[PDB]
Amino acid sequence: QTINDSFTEGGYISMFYQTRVVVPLSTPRKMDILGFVSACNDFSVRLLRDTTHISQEA
Amino acid sequence: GAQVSSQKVGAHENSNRAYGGSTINYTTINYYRDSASNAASKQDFAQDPSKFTEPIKDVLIKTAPTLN
Amino acid sequence: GAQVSSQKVGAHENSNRAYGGSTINYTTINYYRDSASNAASKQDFAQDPSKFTEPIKDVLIKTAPTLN
Amino acid sequence: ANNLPDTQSSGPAHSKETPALTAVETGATNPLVPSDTVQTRHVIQKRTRSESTVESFFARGACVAIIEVDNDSKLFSVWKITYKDTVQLRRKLEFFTYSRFDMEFTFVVTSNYTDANNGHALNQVYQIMYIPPGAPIPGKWNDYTWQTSSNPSVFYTYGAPPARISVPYVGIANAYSHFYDGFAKVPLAGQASTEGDSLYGAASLNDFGSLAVRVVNDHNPTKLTSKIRVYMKPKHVRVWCPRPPRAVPYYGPGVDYKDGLAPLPGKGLTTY
Amino acid sequence: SVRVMQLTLGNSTITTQEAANSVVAYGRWPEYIKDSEANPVDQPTEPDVAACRFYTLDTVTWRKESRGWWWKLPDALKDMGLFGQNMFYHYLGRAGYTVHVQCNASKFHQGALGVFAVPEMCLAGDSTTHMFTKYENANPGEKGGEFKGSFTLDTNATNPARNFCPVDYLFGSGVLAGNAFVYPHQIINLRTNNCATLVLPYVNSLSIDSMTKHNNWGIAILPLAPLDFATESSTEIPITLTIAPMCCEFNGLRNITVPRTQ
Amino acid sequence: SVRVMQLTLGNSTITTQEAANSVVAYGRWPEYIKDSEANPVDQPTEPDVAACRFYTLDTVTWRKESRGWWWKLPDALKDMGLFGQNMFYHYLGRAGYTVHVQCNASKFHQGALGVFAVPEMCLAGDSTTHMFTKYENANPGEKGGEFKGSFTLDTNATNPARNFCPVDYLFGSGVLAGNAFVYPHQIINLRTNNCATLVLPYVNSLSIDSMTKHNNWGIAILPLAPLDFATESSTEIPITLTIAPMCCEFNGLRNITVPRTQ
Amino acid sequence: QRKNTMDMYRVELNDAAHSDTPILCLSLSPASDPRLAHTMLGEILNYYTHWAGSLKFTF
């Protein structure tokens, strides 16, 4: 289901340092990483419904 | 001018009619001259997402190094 | 796309139409693409109750001793 | 849904074959027919089991809900979809553990003036909107949610034949479970008792969503009430694993019981 | 003959000289998931001989006053060797079973035990709050539970027991026990047999599920004809339960699950 | 290329962009016991994906002063998921391994680590009593041990340590470390590679043995050229060890073994 | 401080000594987890009641 429900819970994603980030001198010691998400070729959805991501007052 | 298509049977009844024959087909006839009056057939095709997922000039293999 | 099945005539009229011809048949045509929209054909099959009545591993004959 | 076998004539016997004797400990039922224990005549059997097929047993529209709306928040109502609000259809479905079918919903709508001598209103139009689990639920009888750009809605005009729609097999499993011996959560060691606790025999908190019903007309100060009786019929039926039927009164959505625990009457052992 | 058998699974063998045949539930023998019915895409683990073997759960004692016993599967086997390990290390698990109930007496004893295998054996609770039985009580493990002769409502609001209250003649679920024969079963009538043997395929509305959240089968043992002996008001005969999982396959490996207890 | 690789075992994948090829010990890839070399007659268990996957043991830190580290197999993996379970539930066990040592730095760091896989890696003790090292000390598990720069005899007669005293230049066994190159190995020279990868077949004088009594392989890591950086007398880079058992098959199932500890 | 700014997309790393604590944590609820619910994938999933299939995370 597309809602938070324990019956259809999916699991956990996490990241850890395997070794460590190493930089030489004269180099920034902190840097960013960006994450991306996409569906694989076996992905499908069903039962069209209305989204809660858009509303209209009055 | 009738169009006879077959349905994609989901739940099957304990009948052989649920697995074959005209019993798993549906019939359609257009009554209006303007195509706008027609219903949607819903026998719609798909395509390759490549134009969005990989709009790359020099085609690359996933097993092979992207940056070469 | 018409499906023509025959009816199981219960009470018979004093006609030959009550015993033969298209007069003891009924016609069906599906109008919707989704099988869910269909009516029930009701030409449903039966099966062997054995899975419930005799879920025994070593098959036994009624004439023969059950406890052998 | 077919024929029954003919009775073959059977004469006297004096043999070592004894079909009358058996041993029910095996877990099997003795498949005897009259000719096994008495002398029979030949009877050409014409009776059939056409009406006791799984399909014919359920081929009836049963009431599952009576939704009420007072057109003077009651200007609209929401009904959580279920078959357990009533007892008749529920008991029939529970002869089996799992099921798979399509559904036909017919809506019988009635309305009336609360006052015998007051008020008046023009013909009412109703909107029955299906809110799939996840979609925004209406807060007012006229907020943005009633635009139904994606949710399926049914607009019924009072006085017209009962509305009717078909729904496919919508389960997220390969069959509907009439019984679920489990929980939606597993409490883990170490977590607070408030944690990992869930209802016994419950799957999703919102299985099939709900119906939001309202009268579309602008409400008049007149006192009016409407009731939408929902009838559901399983069509294209398949069922698995038979179970004994409910003997005592239902006590909630579960198999819980409390009240009518002594269903059988008294009868003398040697009284016909 | 119908009466002598030998069952061998892994490194365990069971022999019997007084059987009454064996029942294969719904006529289906346990099997692995076929590719056409597969759901999780990851490679399954199939312990085979390490998990598919006979495990003997605790022995219960039958007395003139016993009302009955019940167990839940895979629950009763959660602490059994490598079967339990695989159950807790994987998100999903599937298995069939060979249930062998043992009970011998003598030619001067009487009594009959009804052994039923019930798919989705939901039991009734003890409070006015619906579906209130808590996880810890619903899953007793190898010790299982017992049937009662009557319903007794838990009234302690401060500390509700949140337990089951399975009344025997109501089959612990609001149905008459005499109709429980529609479920795969055997009867251990002391004058006829020593045991009951049932082969159970995996039954569920899914091909694979969570073994920790869901119990597929329930085993119910009820005294159909009470235990009686010579003239000894005092009589006790043990009932041992030996079960072997079959065609075990698990999917979704991660860190081990440690459920909350008591 | 010789430098980019991906290893997939079960549900675990390892990628590297700075490899120096991989070594397959003695040119033998791990395999299962053939019928012509079989000994125990019982049906083996082969956990497959549940046991044959990458397990990451604890990360150690390399400093200018480090002398070296060592581990024993299957010992270091005894508490690793379902591999450890199968190891303890069975009398006999056999497995090969894929050892992947990880160590990244920068282009301004120096140092070289010699990674050796030694069959029957017997280490020297600390007392005048021969073969006095006790079981608990010989089998440290995933944390392994360390090499020393010199031999120091344990003199506490009242409470002997009964531990190893592996001197680095003596390869912890009375042989010169420079000759340890006759054993399958790789070198992690910081200016060249990130890791070392070794595929180890099962080596023993028997087809299968007791995994609790006997360690087949030993992994020794020695700083051949000490760690040095820019001008930081202070430098620490972690060394992570990831090992995956291969072709696991166990024989002789019984109750679980619980060895004495510390 | 980062939500609803360009910083909500940046996860910072550093050259500190090795630690076994997580850099980030997420729940696989593509349509409901706040971090996934507003991605193109999450936006589409919110127009449907059921989802099934594999996903891939690229860093």
Ligand SMILES: COc1ccc(OCc2ccc(COc3c(Cl)cccc3Cl)cc2)c(Cl)c1
């Ligand atoms: C085992 O027995 C079962 C299983 C499922 C059931 O309900 C499933 C269910 C799911 C969606 C809808 C939504 O149907 C509707 C729609 Cl799209 C539009 C308008 C009105 C309705 Cl009404 C209705 C029922 C019931 Cl009632 C009994």
